[PDB]
């Protein structure tokens, strides 16, 4: 496949 | 809206230089890549020149690659084309182009053919040996009976009309053709029936000389 | 017009099928905003994201922009009251939530839809005036420290700061994004930084209206959000704040062709190559980006993945681009490794280079693209509607980097095929820019280098320009091939109409001993889509720890196969997830109902057929022994909820339990055990979506009669379908059950008050309760006392059973979380008997609110009659019977129930506590209740023995 | 590289194809008024905007076919095809000039004596005909000539020709064209 509080 | 404005267009000689620029007007030549083709008298299209400011390279013509060169002027919108020496060859007409597309890469090295919206008007380059006044001998009429004129020995637009423009009617202005002389020469004839050797009383112009003969 | 409005975009370009009304514009102190007008809406949204990230800090406190975030909550100069905002949202069925990347600030709320303006209000003045209290600030400081605390051992965390460690030391890149006690207030009391105007300066510096971008989501029409935007926001200053740029790239030419070697925490094997690329933002609607990584990133036949992995050295593959920041970008391609794959590193490089080559070979390609494009439109078409809250964070971040009129349709959308980009991406993956790093255990005491934020353990070297070569030269591979047409693209998106004899809720269409069908065909959202849900039963599943260990490498066997063939699908907006459970199997297929009928057979068939490759399983199986070893590293807190689960269950298999029977399953064993669980099932489903009442009948009857030949399966009896239940703790009890966590040093505990069987009265008595203590929990627990980041308070349901439970994270020691709980259990009875009846009635409705919001999605919509079905308790109208029945609840209808059943000395307290302990550790306030003397639990299965099991839960239907 | 035919001529309504031959495997079609600046037609199969969906790109092995399904009055110019190529380079076809087609017309042939010069000058006329193709020799040598051609007149359509013509002078014209039953000539010598 590929790519996808605080970050 | 997008539009491209040429300028530098005049009359020029061998061994000298010229240097037409291209506004651009709508858009950033920062995007973009511009292109300069050319148009020969009569004949059809010629690419001369072509430069990506994005990627940063150039590319010319076998045609010319020595006498010409490219360039772009990021902040005030404007490509370049260095014309510094001359030849009779490069006496054309010169457009600016772009490309449809942003950022088309330069170095590809397959050909994607992507239009050119967006063309300018062109400048008109000239490039001449002598200027002279147009020699004009006439001609003589023997139901129509077509009369004329002949300009003979002219160099490179001529505007030929009959009467003021009140005689549109039948006024074929020849094309002009380079004799071998290295001059120009066209006739202008116009029908008219043979009724008319009364009669109601051929204008030349020629400004590179400021020759205007009424023969 | 309007003064306070710079422009106002043409039509936003939406969806069909969107019934929303949108409305984009420019303020005049330059904040772009979208309207979202839904008459529909229950709960209102809105959200504010800032352009400016934690790549904007001071070199010296790192993470202030963190800080920020979370200060910028407790409190204005118009709402002065610390948790104003946070109370105000909780009492009318709301909620909030913030986050800080690298270059944006996102802050976003939901809340009733007729208290939009009363919250939205409270939400702009973040903005124009935050008070920056001290106590605050020297209070929630060791909430960001909690924070960071609970990632200091994760091992993705530890990964994404080494790699902007291994850059250029000052570029902005390699800054510390998130912030610790250190940072904020250690160092800068040495330095001696004020850091209260530190944030003051901040604020006036970089919060400026230029670089915002509003979302507002309301009942209220498009020209009343206007009014209410424009009211509130064009007061905001303008500062013409320049947008941070970072065009230099943090990997330059000394950082390049670097190999890394890496102790992780966990024992996992992963491979990490990367190259650096040019910020491909601008070029997003040819999107050569994610066209070369769909192309390498493939699962299908002929793939990377496909050759790497049916050679046994990798089982997962990512491709793609990542984003950095504005100026530059990368593109990795991570793989997970084998215990042979480990060995050959540098062999799996050169297949991937061998692909790179491949693509170059054959250059772009058109139908690859077109096929995207084509499927992007369908996705965007037909897609589901988003939640509010989370709908208008999205869409505030892309405000920036796109025109108003395009924002919905920007990341979804591509026009024209630019491969003249696609060569330039991929004439940048080339070896001399490879960026290669290797995470094993295996280089543990081979290591020079230490991480200063998390003290990774790692080393760089220089990766052979012997090696480099061998790369630059890789000959093409002839089972690398580009992929083939996808023939899963669907093609009927017909809405059937809806039948005469349809019903609201799913209704019983065939009941035989062997199968259960639940149907309803969708009312609500008419789209090509249909859910498909399965529970297959089987006594067999989870008998004993054997038995459960081979029905996970079964299923897990199973997915592994189907892999490559359902990839195409997955693209083509049709997925499916199977998975164990503690009763048997659960299959569920989502998506378009155009090929599903395709898809179910290929994985019925599949699965009543397996032929297992023995390579695999052994792989798959060691990749299960780490999976059950790798638990010591999980967080303390989980900890406490696996334990809990453990505690509070008939039966259930604990980790080392599984793991040590896991050696005893060999190849023979396993397939011998695959017919015998099929031999005999229950298989109770849910068929949801645009299919008839024939259809689902149809495919329900298509999947027995797979099962009924390729395992000849024959139903299970009545009296087999036993389903576990809860243990039932005595009177006044207290048990406590205690462990360490190896890893993390911050301790987890969980206090489960149990109370008692799930009805009509007693959940509504519980849900009511946890609304009206759930800001005070947060407010009390952690924004006052600051036990930890993780604050975690409301109701537990397992096995038909309910109560109410605690989570906290802390450094302190458990029994100090167990009685600062207490304590402020005492608060809170208190202050209900004094909060006024209006008071009382505000959190009813705020209750009522929240459990009325009607789904979204049709997946949405699923999920609720799939948890009244295999919770078994068929509650299809459940939502209206309890709301209509909390209404009618008083005050004293609440005290009554604290007395008896939650109070420190109630007659009926079922108290059970887990006490996670950290790595190393031993044995202004209320002040809390002397606590009976807790019985410790010794031996779990010694400890179910002692207490009767409760009842399970009557269904509301009779059969 | 090489476009034919150089010359088309039809009828408003016809259909018309032009084709472009070839390495870059796509091509351009551009469209330029006598005097003026090109305008863009098609790119890549797909055309530009604002050009009549009358105007076709297809593309058969090596060569590549500009359609003009309905011929308008207002489509009557000279079209380029235009490639792109490795090198960043652009190449144009010499261009095809797509005329007007009429009726057959023969030429009203006239001629004309050498103020005078002081060099031998005498002119040739060809007036209003069609089509151009016509054949003009002397009472005859050598290269001694160039011979204009007009365009077609913007009322009936017709050409107009001139074939040009002092060491034989003072020492002492028959056309053949197909729309003449046989060679005609105006004779006059001194
Ligand atoms: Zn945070």
Known sequence: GIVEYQL | ?215 | ?959 | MTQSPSSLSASVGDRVTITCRAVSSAVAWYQQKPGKAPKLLIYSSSLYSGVPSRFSGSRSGTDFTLTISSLQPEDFATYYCQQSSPSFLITFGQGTKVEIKRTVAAPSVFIFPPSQLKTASVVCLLNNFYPREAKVQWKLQSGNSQESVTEQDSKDSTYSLSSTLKADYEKHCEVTHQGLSSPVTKSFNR
């Open chain 2, 1 to 215: 809206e997008v539009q491209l404005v040429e300028s530098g267009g005049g009359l020029v000689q061998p061994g000298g230089s010229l240097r037409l620029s291209c506004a651009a007007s709508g858009f950033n030549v920062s995007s973009y890549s511009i292109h300069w083709v050319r148009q020969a008298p009569g004949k059809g299209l010629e690419w001369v020149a072509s430069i990506s400011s994005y990627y940063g390279s150039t590319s010319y013509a076998d045609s010319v690659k020595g006498r010409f060169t490219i360039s772009a002027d990021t902040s005030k919108n404007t490509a370049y084309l260095q014309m510094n020496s001359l030849r009779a060859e490069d006496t054309a007409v010169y457009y600016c182009a772009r490309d449809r597309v942003m950022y088309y890469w330069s170095f590809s090295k397959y050909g994607y053919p992507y239009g050119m919206d967006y063309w300018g008007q062109g400048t008109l380059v000239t490039v001449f040996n002598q200027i002279k006044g147009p020699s004009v001998f006439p001609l003589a009429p023997s139901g129509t009976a077509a009369l004329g004129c002949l300009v003979k020995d002219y160099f490179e637009p001529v505007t030929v009309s009959w009467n003021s423009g009140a005689l549109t009617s039948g006024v074929h202005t020849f094309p002009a053709v380079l004799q071998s002389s290295g001059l120009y020469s066209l006739s202008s004839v116009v029908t008219v029936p043979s009724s008319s050797l009364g009669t109601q009383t051929c204008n030349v112009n020629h400004k590179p000389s400021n020759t205007k003969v009424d023969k």
């Open chain 3, 1 to 959: 017009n309007n003064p306070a409005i710079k422009r106002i975009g043409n039509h936003i370009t939406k969806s069909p099928e969107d019934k929303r009304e949108y409305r984009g514009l420019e303020l005049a102190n330059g904040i772009k905003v979208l309207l979202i007008s839904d008459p529909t809406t229950d709960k209102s949204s809105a959200a504010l994201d800032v352009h400016i990230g934690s790549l904007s800090d001071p070199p010296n406190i790192a993470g202030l922009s963190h800080f920020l975030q979370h200060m910028l909550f407790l409190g204005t100069k118009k709402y002065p009251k610390e948790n104003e905002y946070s109370q105000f949202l909780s009492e009318h069925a709301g909620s909030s939530n913030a986050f800080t990347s690298g270059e944006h600030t996102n802050y976003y709320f939901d809340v009733s839809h007729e208290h939009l303006e009363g919250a939205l209000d409270r939400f702009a003045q973040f903005f124009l005036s935050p008070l920056f209290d001290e106590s605050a600030k020297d209070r929630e400081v060791n909430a960001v420290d909690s924070e960071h605390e609970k990632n200091v051992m994760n091992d993705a965390w530890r990964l994404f700061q080494l790699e902007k460690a291994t850059g250029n030391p000052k570029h902005p890149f390699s800054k510390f994004g998130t912030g610790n006690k250190y940072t904020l207030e250690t160092r800068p009391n040495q330095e001696g930084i004020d850091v209260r105007q530190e944030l003051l300066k901040f604020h006036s510096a970089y919060y400026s209206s230029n670089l915002m971008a509003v979302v507002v989501l309301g009942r209220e029409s498009l020209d009343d959000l206007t009014n209410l935007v424009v009211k509130l926001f064009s007061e905001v200053e303008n500062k013409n704040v320049p947008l941070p740029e970072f065009p230099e790239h943090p990997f330059q030419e000394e950082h390049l062709k670097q190999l890394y070697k890496i102790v992780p925490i966990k024992d996992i094997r992963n491979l990490y190559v990367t190259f650096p690329i040019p910020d491909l933002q601008k070029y997003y609607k040819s999107n050569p980006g994610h066209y070369l990584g769909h192309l390498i990133g493939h699962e299908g036949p002929g793939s990377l993945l496909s050759e790497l992995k049916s050679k046994g050295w990798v089982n997962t593959l990512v491709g793609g681009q990542k984003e950095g920041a504005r100026g530059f970008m990368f593109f990795i391609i991570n793989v997970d490794l084998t215990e042979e794959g480990l060995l050959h590193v540098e062999d799996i490089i050169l297949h991937m280079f061998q692909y790179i080559q491949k693509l170059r070979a054959e250059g772009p390609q058109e139908w690859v693209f077109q096929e995207l494009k084509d499927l992007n439109a369908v996705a965007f078409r037909f897609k589901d509607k988003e939640r509010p809250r989370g709908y208008t964070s999205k869409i505030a971040g892309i405000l920036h980097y796109y025109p108003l009129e395009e924002v919905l349709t920007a990341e979804y959308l591509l026009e024209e095929f630019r491969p003249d980009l696609i060569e330039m991406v991929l004439d940048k993956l080339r070896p001399e820019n490879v960026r290669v790093a290797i995470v094993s255990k295996s280089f543990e005491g081979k290591t020079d280098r230490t991480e200063e934020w998390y003290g990774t353990q790692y080393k760089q070297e220089a990766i052979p320009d012997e090696v480099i070569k061998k790369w630059q030269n890789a000959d093409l591979n002839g089972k690398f091939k580009l992929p083939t047409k996808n023939e899963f693209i669907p093609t009927n998106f017909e809405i059937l109409p809806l039948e005469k004899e349809a019903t609201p809720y799913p209704a019983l269409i065939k009941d035989t001993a062997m199968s259960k069908l639940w149907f309803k065909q969708d009312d609500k959202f008419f789209l090509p889509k249909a859910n498909l849900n399965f529970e297959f039963f089987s006594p067999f599943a989870y008998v004993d720890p054997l038995h459960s260990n081979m029905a996970y490498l079964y299923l897990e066997l199973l997915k592994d196969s189907l892999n490559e063939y359902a990839y195409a699908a997955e693209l083509a907006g049709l997925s499916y997830d199977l998975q164990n459970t503690i009763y048997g199997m659960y299959l569920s297929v989502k998506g378009y109902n155009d090929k599903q009928p395709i898809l179910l057979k290929k994985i019925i068939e599949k699965m009543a057929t397996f032929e297992i490759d023995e390579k695999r399983f052994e792989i798959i199986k060691e990749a299960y022994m780490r999976s059950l070893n790798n638990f010591r590293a999980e967080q303390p807190h989980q900890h406490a909820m696996y334990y809990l689960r453990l505690l509070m269950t008939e039966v259930a298999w604990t980790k080392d339990e599984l793991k040590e029977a896991l050696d005893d399953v060999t190849l023979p064993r396993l397939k011998a055990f695959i017919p015998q669980l099929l031999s005999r099932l229950h298989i109770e489903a849910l068929l949801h979506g645009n299919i008839t009442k024939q259809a689902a009948l149809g495919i329900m009857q298509m999947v027995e009669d797979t099962l009924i030949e390729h395992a000849h399966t024959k139903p299970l009896l009545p009296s087999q379908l036993v389903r576990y239940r809860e243990v039932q703790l005595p009177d006044r009890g207290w048990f406590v059950y205690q462990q360490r966590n190896e890893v993390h040093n911050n301790s987890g505990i969980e206090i489960y008050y149990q109370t008692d069987m799930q009805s009509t009265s007693e959940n509504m008595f519980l849900e009511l309760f946890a609304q009206i203590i759930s800001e005070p929990a947060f407010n009390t627990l952690r924004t006052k006392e600051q036990l930890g980041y993780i604050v975690f308070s409301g109701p537990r349901r397992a096995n038909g059973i309910q109560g109410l439970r605690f989570i906290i994270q802390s450094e302190k020691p458990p029994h100090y979380l167990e009685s600062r709980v207490e304590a402020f259990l005492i608060t809170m009875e208190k202050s209900i008997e004094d909060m006024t009846e209006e008071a009382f009635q505000k959190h009813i409705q705020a209750l009522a609110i929240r459990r009325l919001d009607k789904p979204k999605k049709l997946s949405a919509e699923s999920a609720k009659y799939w948890g009244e079905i295999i919770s078994q308790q068929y509650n299809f109208d459940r939502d209206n019977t309890e709301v209509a029945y909390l209404k009618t609840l008083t005050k004293e209808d609440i005290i009554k129930f604290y007395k008896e059943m939650l109070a420190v000395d109630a007659p009926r307290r079922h108290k059970v506590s887990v006490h996670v302990l950290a790595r190393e550790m031993d044995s202004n306030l209320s002040q809390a209740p002397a606590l009976p003397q807790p019985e410790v639990i010794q031996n779990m299965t010694e400890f179910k023995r002692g207490l009767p099991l409760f009842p399970l839960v009557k269904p509301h239907i009779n059969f």
